[PDB]
């Protein structure tokens, strides 16, 4: 079993802690935790390629996309490995994260350790937006908070 | 060449950016960077096991030691994988780091990606201090700043 943890922080008030657990196998990864001070509504949630936070969340690069596909939702056939969809913040700005994904991994190739998890400004349209940007970023907007995914015990 | 980067920050003014570069899977890793706001003198510099900073540098765990070896310096046969010795801060409190290590790696089992790089308050005795702590931590003291090592371009 492998565990990973990520502490999200940004230029503003958004902060949170997301845990990852991949039961003793190369099976699905369970992602869970919470993010606070988020505006009410949907927020794009993705794993970006670089675990470089030298210029904040901007240096994290594009979505992790080892297979060079187009952006999509988590349950779509075509998506970037790092496409985790949207998390939802309530009227209090708290987003409860509970995701189970079988595309990301905590080990080998589709490995997200040492990469950046980011929560966005707007909702991810899951590639259905009908414009150029939709198939790249899902039109999720700016990066509110991010963190480098590290190994945990 | 594989690259990684680490942004060091702590509950203090100590901060720095360290770059890692490894040409081949087997081969030395060059670590280059600089940290500032340090007190002039020697300061412990090690890779700790967990990339967990939920509780600051406190949650990074002990030195990365997959081989169950005792604490030492970079040139010692007997050393933890994460033992990078001392970093020297000058009168202005700036510590330039230019290390080449053959035990740490950005690939494989000794992989430091996703773990925490930490700069200590005191000098690291390189495990020659003659007491339990020396063979454990090198008596380097507090963790002033730290960061999770992530993938870079
Ligand atoms: Cu994103
Ligand atoms: Cu240490
Ligand atoms: Zn995407
Ligand atoms: Zn050590």
UniProtKB/Swiss-Prot annotation, chains A, B:
Crosslinked residue numbers (1-(tryptophan-3-yl)-tryptophan (Trp-Trp) (interchain with W-33)): 32
Binding positions for Zn(2+) per the UniProt entry: 63, 71, 80, 83
Modified residues (Phosphoserine): 98, 102, 105, 107
Matches recorded under InterPro entries: SOD-like_Cu/Zn_dom_sf, SOD_Cu/Zn_/chaperone, SOD_Cu/Zn_BS, SOD_Cu_Zn_dom
E.C. no: 1.15.1.1
SUPFAM superfamilies per the UniProt record, alphabetical: Cu,Zn superoxide dismutase-like
Known catalytic reactions: 2 superoxide + 2 H(+) = H2O2 + O2
Record annotation: effect of changing residue 85 to R: In ALS1; ubiquitinated by RNF19A; interferes with zinc-binding; ubiquitinated by MARCHF5; leading to the degradation of mitochondrial SOD1
Any matching Pfam family: Sod_Cu
CDD domains: Cu-Zn_Superoxide_Dismutase (cd00305)
Effect of residue 146 to S: Enhances formation of fibrillar aggregates in the absence of bound zinc
Gene Ontology MF terms: copper ion binding; identical protein binding; protein homodimerization activity; protein phosphatase 2B binding; protein-folding chaperone binding; small GTPase binding; superoxide dismutase activity; zinc ion binding
Annotated positions binding Cu cation: 46, 48, 63, 120
Described function: Destroys radicals which are normally produced within the cells and which are toxic to biological systems.
Disease per record: Amyotrophic lateral sclerosis 1: A neurodegenerative disorder affecting upper motor neurons in the brain and lower motor neurons in the brain stem and spinal cord, resulting in fatal paralysis. Sensory abnormalities are absent. The pathologic hallmarks of the disease include pallor of the corticospinal tract due to loss of motor neurons, presence of ubiquitin-positive inclusions within surviving motor neurons, and deposition of pathologic aggregates. The etiology of amyotrophic lateral sclerosis is likely to be multifactorial, involving both genetic and environmental factors. Spastic tetraplegia and axial hypotonia, progressive: An autosomal recessive, neurologic disorder characterized by loss of motor abilities in the first year of life, after which severe, progressive spastic tetraparesis develops. Affected individuals have severe axial hypotonia, hyperekplexia, hypertonia, and myokymia, reflecting upper motor neuron involvement. Cognitive development may be affected.
Alphabetical list of PANTHER family matching this protein: SUPEROXIDE DISMUTASE CU-ZN -RELATED
Protein's recorded name: Superoxide dismutase [Cu-Zn]
Originating species: Homo sapiens
Name of the gene this protein is made from: SOD1
């Amino acid at each position: 079993a492998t565990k990973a943890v990520c502490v999200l922080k940004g230029d503003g008030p958004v902060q949170g802690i997301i845990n990852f657990e991949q039961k003793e196998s190369n099976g699905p990864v369970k992602v869970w935790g919470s993010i606070k001070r988020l505006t009410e509504g949907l927020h794009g949630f993705h794993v970006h390629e670089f675990g470089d936070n030298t210029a904040g969340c901007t240096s994290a690069g594009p979505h992790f996309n080892p297979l060079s596909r187009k952006h999509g939702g988590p349950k779509d056939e075509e998506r970037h490995v790092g496409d985790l969809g949207n998390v939802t913040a309530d009227k209090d700005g708290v987003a409860d994260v509970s995701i189970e994904d079988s595309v990301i991994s905590l080990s080998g190739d589709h490995c997200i350790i040492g990469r950046t998890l980011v929560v966005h400004e707007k909702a991810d349209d899951l590639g259905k937006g009908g414009n150029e940007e939709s198939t790249k970023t899902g039109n999720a907007g700016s990066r509110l908070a991010c963190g480098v995914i590290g190994i945990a015990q």
